[PDB]
Amino acid sequence: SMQEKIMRELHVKPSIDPKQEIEDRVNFLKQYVKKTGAKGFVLGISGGQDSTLAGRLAQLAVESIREEGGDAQFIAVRLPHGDDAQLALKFIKPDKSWKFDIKSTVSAFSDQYQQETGDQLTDFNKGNVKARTRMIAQYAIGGQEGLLVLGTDHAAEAVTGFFTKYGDGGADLLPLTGLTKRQGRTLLKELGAPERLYLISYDEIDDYLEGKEVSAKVSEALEKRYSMTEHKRQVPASMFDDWWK
Amino acid sequence: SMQEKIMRELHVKPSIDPKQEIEDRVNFLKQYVKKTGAKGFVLGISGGQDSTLAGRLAQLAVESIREEGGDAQFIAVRLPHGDDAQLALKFIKPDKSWKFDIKSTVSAFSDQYQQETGDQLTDFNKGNVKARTRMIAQYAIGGQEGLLVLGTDHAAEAVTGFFTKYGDGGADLLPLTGLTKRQGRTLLKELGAPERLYLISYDEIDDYLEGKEVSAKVSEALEKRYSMTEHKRQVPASMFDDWWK
Ligand SMILES: Nc1ncnc2c1ncn2[C@@H]1O[C@H](COP(=O)(O)OP(=O)(O)OC[C@@H]2O[C@@H]([n+]3cccc(C(=O)O)c3)[C@H](O)[C@H]2O)[C@@H](O)[C@H]1O
Ligand SMILES: Nc1ncnc2c1ncn2[C@@H]1O[C@H](COP(=O)(O)OP(=O)(O)OC[C@H]2O[C@@H]([n+]3cccc(C(=O)O)c3)[C@H](O)[C@H]2O)[C@@H](O)[C@H]1O
């Protein structure tokens, strides 16, 4: 069963206890940060469900450590290129709120590309340049502050390879691993998040991930997109690896 | 033995056959391309040993693909920030030779940094932005031209994690994996490279990786640095990973 193997590899459960998932995940963040000796975390907050869930979990993790007598801080940054993000910040309530506007770095790069090359960066290619500029901003803040960069990647986002390689894919740790989009909505409700924040088909993708009976149409499409994106789920390939064969 | 253990995880051979090494690496490049249906490669050339070896190997792979009736090309890019790179291009003889100056993109980033945070990026942190900016440059080109981005990482720098995480460490495939510094120099000599292009120390780092006997001070320093940089050789950390605990 390819569905069983994928389900296994991405760490998806068929059923979850949301309260215990919140606990398990906050504990992972605490634990990783005490192990490494880092000062806390930094995460880009966009207004979307994922970064909202991931940011609230990081504020809870940082607060528990300070309660045990340690030093930890959480920096939430807004990364615009020139309302829900603000709603997300009122809910998360981070220790610090920053902002870094990526419009001038992206422009400078575009102009240079045309100047040097003789071509315009296509929408799709400039789209990835923005995702990668935001990575650099998060790593520059973490670098300056002694913090770890959180990633908002999860299962439904992992099966489809739906993220920019080294853009939002470039992170130090990932608290939402193994969760589906629907399971991620459950946690948010448990956390008492405003509904506006958590509200083939994505719900179809969650069904397959949760081991539910799906249509071969969907199954086959999913299993091919997966093998097609394995490279984004591994470290750069060498002749000593086999997954790409 | 940790010397033995690291040597194996990094794929180093105590003894190599130079000509066979070349053929194996050219064959890896050819084989990856065929499986994925890529059009070719792109790599930043700097004048140093590593980019010079990786680049000469890409060119031979690409010339060999076409002689079999295939479609492939290699673009070598100069990535200045404001003599040997020229000598290198003269030796590699790549299909296409481009250039992208990263100074304006970096100054745009640093300027907005100070403007946003009040503080200025440390020289060290500005240097990691430059490395990450060269990855965006290469990835924009591979995206616009439909090419895979080559990486220069090899065993002599993986042990020390002597690279920028998502900067020069961000690549699609790595043809120099498992080679030590002097071993790479030996490949360049087989290929007939001009001597100026290749002319803890590296000798001690290489002796350790090649399994030669070295002083306790060397093993202690390398094994410590190796442990603290494991995150650079692994996929982002999650609660289902044991390597970090
Ligand atoms: N098989 C192969 N082996 C090794 N490397 C391979 C490769 N195939 C492509 N590549 C490389 O990977 C590339 C394509 O990947 P990438 O640059 O990521 O680009 P791409 O697949 O074009 O996807 C970037 C994006 O992911 C989505 N996105 C981005 C950011 C966030 C979210 C979200 O939902 O949060 C979604 C979206 O559809 C889009 O804007 C290449 O140009 C290439 O150099
Ligand atoms: N334990 C941990 N678990 C998960 N993630 C962790 C972490 N420890 C650090 N990190 C993270 O990774 C970071 C450090 O990695 P990174 O950003 O690469 O930075 P860092 O290791 O300081 O790299 C700067 C450099 O890499 C080297 N480099 C780069 C380019 C060229 C050359 C040259 O000399 O020509 C050398 C060299 O040692 C140096 O100049 C942190 O800011 C943090 O975000």
Which string of DSSP letters, residue by residue, matches A153-186? Answer: -BHHHHHTT-S-TTTTT--SB-TBTT--HHHHHH
Ligand-binding annotation for B165, yes or no, is yes
Angle between helices B49-66 and B84-92 (to 10 degrees): 20
Dihedral pair phi/psi, residue A179, rounded to 5°: -90, 145
Question: Is A97 strand, coil or helix?
Answer: strand
Kind and range of the H or E run holding A76: strand A73-78
Say how far apart CA B128 and CA B133 lie, in whole Å. 8
CATH of residue B172: 3.40.50.620
Dihedral pair phi/psi, residue B74, rounded to 5°: -130, 130
The residue type found at B87 is L
B84, B197 contact by CB (below 8 A): yes
Which residue in A154, A184, A211 sits closest to A22, CA to CA? Answer: A184
- Whether B144 and A128 lie within 8 Å, measured CB to CB: no
- Whether B140 and A129 lie within 8 Å, measured CB to CB: yes
Q: Whose CA is nearest to atom 32 of ligand 1?
A: A163
Please list every protein residue whose CB sits less than 6 Å from any atom of ligand 2.
A 36, 139, 142-143, 148-149, 172; B 128, 131, 162-165, 168, 231, 237
Ligand-binding annotation for B3, yes or no, is no
Q: In what order do the strands lie in the sheet with A73-78?
A: A96-99, A73-78, A40-44, A148-149
Long-range contacts from A128-131, C-beta under 8 angstroms, 24+ separation:
A128/A164, A128/A167, A128/B139, A128/B140, A128/B143, A129/B136, A129/B140, A130/A81, A130/A102, A130/A106, A130/A167, A131/A163, A131/A164, A131/A167, A131/A168
Structure tokens at B106: 């970096």
* Cα A167 to ligand 1 centre (Å): 9
DSSP B234: S
Chain breaks in chain B (C to N over 2.5 A) after: 82, 199
CB atoms within 10 A of CB B19: 11
Structure tokens at B64: 């060999």
Our count of domains for chain B comes to: 1
Structure tokens at A101: 């506007």
Report CA-CA distances (Å) from B108 to A46, A245, B77, B83.
23, 42, 22, 27
A121, A93 contact by CB (below 8 A): no
Best mutation site among B106, B124, B128, B160 for ligand 2 pocket (most ligand atoms within 8 Å of CB): B128
The residue type found at B154 is H
Catalytic residue check, A203: no
Residue in B31, B112, B147 to test binding to A, most A beta-carbons within 10 Å: B112
- Provide the CA B59 distance to its chain's centre, in angstroms: 16
Which residue in A171, A163, A129 sits closest to A44, CA to CA? Answer: A171
Say how far apart CA B63 and CA B57 lie, in whole Å. 10
Active-site choice (A21, A153, A157, A210): A157
Catalytic residue check, A50: yes
What is chain A's alpha carbon radius of gyration, rounded to the nearest angstrom? 19
Q: In what order do the strands lie in the sheet with B73-78?
A: B96-99, B73-78, B40-45, B148-149
Report which bound ligand comes closest to the CA of A173.
2
Contacts of A180 (CB under 8 A, 6+ apart): A12, A154, A155, A156, A205, A206, A209, A210
Ligand 1 atom with least separation from CA of A152: 35
Residues from chain B contacting residue A121 (CB–CB below 8 Å): 140, 144
Residues B89-108 as b or e (16 or more Cβ within 10 Å = b)? bebbebbeebebbbebbbbb
Q: Which residues pair with B96 in a beta bridge?
A: B75
Task: Count helices and strands (H / E) in chain A.
Answer: 11, 4
User: How were these coordinates obtained?
Assistant: X-ray
- A228–B contact, CB cutoff 8 A: no
B148, B30 contact by CB (below 8 A): no
Burial class (CB in 10 A: 0-12, 13-18, 19+), A42: buried
Kind and range of the H or E run holding B42: strand B40-45
| Contacting A residues, span 32-71, partner chain B, CB-CB under 8 Å | 32, 35
Q: Which residues pair with A76 in a beta bridge?
A: A43, A97
Residue in A235, A244, A245 to test binding to B, most B beta-carbons within 10 Å: A235
- Whether A109 and B113 lie within 8 Å, measured CB to CB: no
The owner of tokens 């605490």 is: A30
* Cα A166 to ligand 2 centre (Å): 15
- Whether A153 and B236 lie within 8 Å, measured CB to CB: yes
What is the extent of the structural domain holding A182? 1-245
A29, A41 contact by CB (below 8 A): yes
| Contacting B residues, span 151-210, partner chain A, CB-CB under 8 Å | 151, 153, 165-166, 170-175, 177-178
Burial class (CB in 10 A: 0-12, 13-18, 19+), A114: exposed
Q: Which residues pair with A44 in a beta bridge?
A: A77
Q: Whose CA is nearest to atom 44 of ligand 1?
A: B148
CB atoms within 10 A of CB A146: 12
- Whether B98 and A116 lie within 8 Å, measured CB to CB: yes
Question: Is A192 strand, coil or helix?
Answer: coil
- Whether A143 and B125 lie within 8 Å, measured CB to CB: yes
Say how far apart CA B107 and CA B113 lie, in whole Å. 10
